[PDB]
Design an enzyme around this catalytic site. Structure first.
Site, PDB file in Angstrom:
ATOM      1  N   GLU A  75      10.828  56.391   8.889  1.00  0.00           N
ATOM      2  CA  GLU A  75       9.765  57.074   9.498  1.00  0.00           C
ATOM      3  C   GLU A  75       8.666  56.236  10.268  1.00  0.00           C
ATOM      4  O   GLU A  75       8.306  57.502  10.993  1.00  0.00           O
ATOM      5  CB  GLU A  75       8.588  57.076   7.703  1.00  0.00           C
ATOM      6  CG  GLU A  75       9.446  56.261   6.907  1.00  0.00           C
ATOM      7  CD  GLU A  75       8.008  56.168   5.994  1.00  0.00           C
ATOM      8  OE1 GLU A  75       7.783  56.595   5.546  1.00  0.00           O
ATOM      9  OE2 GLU A  75       8.612  54.633   4.888  1.00  0.00           O
ATOM     10  N   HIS A 106      15.064  63.029   8.238  1.00  0.00           N
ATOM     11  CA  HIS A 106      14.271  61.943   7.646  1.00  0.00           C
ATOM     12  C   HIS A 106      13.501  62.501   6.744  1.00  0.00           C
ATOM     13  O   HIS A 106      12.849  63.560   7.091  1.00  0.00           O
ATOM     14  CB  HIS A 106      13.519  60.811   8.191  1.00  0.00           C
ATOM     15  CG  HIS A 106      13.532  59.819   7.204  1.00  0.00           C
ATOM     16  ND1 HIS A 106      11.815  59.637   7.430  1.00  0.00           N
ATOM     17  CD2 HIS A 106      13.858  59.078   5.910  1.00  0.00           C
ATOM     18  CE1 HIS A 106      11.642  59.245   6.603  1.00  0.00           C
ATOM     19  NE2 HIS A 106      12.749  58.487   5.794  1.00  0.00           N
ATOM     20  N   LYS A 116      12.924  46.206   8.320  1.00  0.00           N
ATOM     21  CA  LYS A 116      11.190  45.292   7.586  1.00  0.00           C
ATOM     22  C   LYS A 116      10.774  44.791   8.400  1.00  0.00           C
ATOM     23  O   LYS A 116      11.542  43.751   8.877  1.00  0.00           O
ATOM     24  CB  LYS A 116      11.147  45.186   5.855  1.00  0.00           C
ATOM     25  CG  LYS A 116      11.681  46.256   5.129  1.00  0.00           C
ATOM     26  CD  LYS A 116      11.388  47.722   4.823  1.00  0.00           C
ATOM     27  CE  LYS A 116      10.538  48.292   3.484  1.00  0.00           C
ATOM     28  NZ  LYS A 116       9.391  48.534   4.522  1.00  0.00           N
ATOM     29  N   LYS A 151       8.636  47.671   8.312  1.00  0.00           N
ATOM     30  CA  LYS A 151       8.602  48.795   8.461  1.00  0.00           C
ATOM     31  C   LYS A 151       7.470  49.766   9.329  1.00  0.00           C
ATOM     32  O   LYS A 151       7.626  50.328  10.899  1.00  0.00           O
ATOM     33  CB  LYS A 151       7.482  49.791   7.554  1.00  0.00           C
ATOM     34  CG  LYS A 151       8.618  51.478   7.224  1.00  0.00           C
ATOM     35  CD  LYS A 151       8.342  51.818   5.720  1.00  0.00           C
ATOM     36  CE  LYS A 151       7.055  52.134   5.686  1.00  0.00           C
ATOM     37  NZ  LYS A 151       7.217  52.959   4.066  1.00  0.00           N
TER      38      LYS A 151
END
Lengths: 443, 419
Positions: free
Chosen positions: B182, B275, B154, B156
């Protein structure tokens, strides 16, 4: 817990357009402050930071999507995405949808302080919208092939035949030649390909040859939509390569139908990138799931198609915030539910309607729409025909055609059979819409 | 009529294997019939006909009260590779949660279980490489060398090239897989080139600070399978000889099947990390419609994802996805030597309540990419994943946690660390 921006004007971001605007219908679990829910909802659309934070302890904000406006008890949440959070390509440099969904209906659609969140509209600046693919063809290309001005060429009529799966290579071939006979566009239906009974190359090899035949017979230029939908990119180029090999002489006539909601974006960028000036036909498939209107976590149907004019799609099903679609895909410059959008070069994606679209109500379809350039796939006005398939869409062409020109369907249908039998095919459709049709038509 | 053969018995559809059995939670719009409508949904799942039939997908059960419909479809319904001849996901998805997914006649229908018979599941792709093809590089027995711990960096996004790198090696130094989340890629702040040149480096620095191998899942996800292709060559190339310590990640639900499959037949020697994500639009229990999340991560290894995101029947899902002669909500599956696609395990599992997972799951052989199990620890997310490393360790060594709190300082401090 980081994030949001409500002083900010929607129409500022619109202008110095170095930002994506998303607009959603979201209601929090129930016992949580709306803004908290939506400042959150955008944390998992951005940087996360997930608490507060700063990455290398440099300002990892200006990446950060902040809710720009919300209406608590209208269940609304508009969020502005900086363009920078969006992925591009390396051997390319282009935008990719695969990042725009992962960003806005990815982790998003999983949070526990949300109940549902539905995307209702979007905005793609210049900045960003233009790093995307766009329809490579349209219906224009079909107009090229049928010999219609590639400007208000108009409606391509088809049929569907029955059943979706079952008839074989030749029982198939021939069904399709026979409808090639009273219309111009025939699809292999969504499931259709390499089932054991009826194989890709046995059956693509003979449709191929039933178009030499119909297009030779009539002497009109018949178009096909063959499904080159696979799991592997290599079997989508290979399904499709033989298709346009076997078609040889006539592959300007071949379309490329892919079951794109159920296939995905890399299946649609294979057909579109590996087969650029061929029409790639999207078949929204197992998509009610989401877009359908009483599922509340989708991307709404309108949002689906807007998304596909951006990504290469030339065509897509329906019309009939869902009469806006038809504008959102064709007109470069048009209003969706919340945000007007500019396409400032990008080429339509075509409305390819279906169903019970009939001959008596066709003309009203074409007035409330205004353009009659849709692709009409028939089972309705077609099998419904009291003179079957053949004359079911040859009453369809008529109906559309009556319309560009200006003839009142009860009397256009007064000069030819296909359309005067439509009237004696549908009740009173002919009683609903067509005033005493019994007297002035026949009876 | 020609779509109901209720009384045409499940055990025998299920001992034949040329009938793919679907169980769903279907419910008709008001006034509308049950079975009638139940057989209507079969007809737009299979054969239409609308106006050679040994092809119609048939209902053999209803529950009305429990409001479900059971559909049983022939196997010569499903499309194939002209090429290879192997089975495909695309048009499977096309018939079962195909058109019936946008009906009229039906309020909603969510698939709850599916049974792929061996004369069709064999035809499928299935995993090339799993979690033992992580084991072998971590240098563990490549037969249950269990827990692979990792992390989640993090923020992200908003992270520069030196930054990830800095933070991957300082989290590598500490505990073994890092995952590119992602949205990370070729973004203009941290462009994959100038950043994957630098992760390479991370890793090689880390392993000479460890003497242990590091693992990096790289979001090789794009929506043109050459891009997809391009990033892989690029990342296994750049990783030079350390290129076995790479997991390829496809942020998976939102990129398709076509995405999933290129990365598994371009680089079937490296770990296709599914994912999930978006899943929940369809896949939440709020959603009365689509497929469910049990179905999404088993559909997943038949297509052979190396490992998917499975973070808790929700170890209904960790059986039917791992094992061999699994079960599930309604049907019992046979993978018939088809490979184990491992649970990537999410969130807040903490250093203290994990062997209770490990015990409660019957195994530790899955991946963790923890948040605060670790983030909330005293020597850092550092000691915070050495704690979990060691959580495991003790656990499987068939010696208890508490006793190893002591021999080993960082887990000690884990209990200690945090309530």
């Amino acid at each position: 817990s980081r994030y949001v921006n409500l002083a900010l004007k929607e129409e500022d971001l619109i202008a110095g357009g170095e930002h994506v605007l998303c607009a959603y219908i979201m209601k929090p679990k129930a016992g949580y402050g709306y803004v908290a829910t939506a400042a959150h909802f955008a944390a998992e659309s951005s940087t996360g930071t997930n608490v507060e934070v700063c990455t290398t302890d440099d300002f990892t904000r200006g990446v950060d999507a902040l809710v720009y406006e919300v209406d608590e008890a209208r269940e609304l949440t508009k969020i502005a995405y900086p363009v920078a959070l969006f992925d591009r390509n390396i051997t390319d440099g282009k935008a990719m949808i695969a990042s725009f969904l992962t960003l806005t209906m990815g982790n998003n659609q999983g949070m526990g302080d949300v109940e549902y969140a539905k995307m209702h509209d979007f905005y793609v600046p210049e900045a960003y919208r233009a790093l995307f693919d766009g329809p490579s063809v349209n219906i224009s290309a079909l107009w090229k092939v049928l010999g219609r001005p590639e400007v208000d060429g108009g409606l391509v009529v088809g049929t569907i035949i029955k059943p979706k799966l079952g008839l074989r290579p030749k029982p198939f071939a021939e069904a399709c030649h026979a409808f090639w006979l009273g219309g111009d566009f025939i699809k292999n239906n969504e499931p259709q390909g390499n089932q054991p009974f009826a194989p890709l190359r046995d059956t693509i090899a003979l449709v191929a040859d039933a178009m030499r035949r119909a297009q030779d017979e009539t002497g009109e230029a018949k178009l096909f939509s063959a499904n080159i939908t696979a799991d592997d990119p290599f079997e989508i180029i290979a399904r499709g390569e033989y298709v346009l090999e076997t078609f040889g002489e006539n592959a300007s006539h071949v379309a490329l139908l892919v079951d794109g909601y159920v296939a995905g974006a890399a299946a649609i960028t294979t057909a579109r990138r590996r087969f650029p000036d061929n029409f790639l036909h999207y078949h929204r498939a197992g998509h009610g799931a989401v877009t359908s209107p009483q599922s509340k976590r989708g991307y709404t149907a309108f949002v689906h198609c807007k998304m596909a004019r951006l990504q290469g799609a030339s065509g897509i099903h329906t019309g009939t915030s869902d009469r806006a679609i038809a504008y959102m895909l064709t007109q470069d410059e048009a209003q969706g539910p919340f945000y007007r959008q500019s396409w400032g070069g990008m080429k339509a994606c075509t409305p390819i309607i279906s169903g019970g679209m009939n001959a008596l109500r066709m003309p009203g379809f074409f007035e409330n729409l205004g353009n009659a350039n849709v692709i009409l796939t028939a089972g309705g006005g077609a099998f419904g025909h009291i003179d079957g398939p053949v004359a079911g869409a040859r009453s369809l062409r008529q109906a559309w055609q009556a319309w560009r020109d200006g003839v009142p369907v009860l009397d256009y249908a007064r000069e030819h059979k296909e359309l005067a039998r439509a009237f004696e095919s549908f009740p009173g459709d002919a009683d609903q819409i067509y005033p005493g049709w019994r007297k002035a038509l026949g009876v």
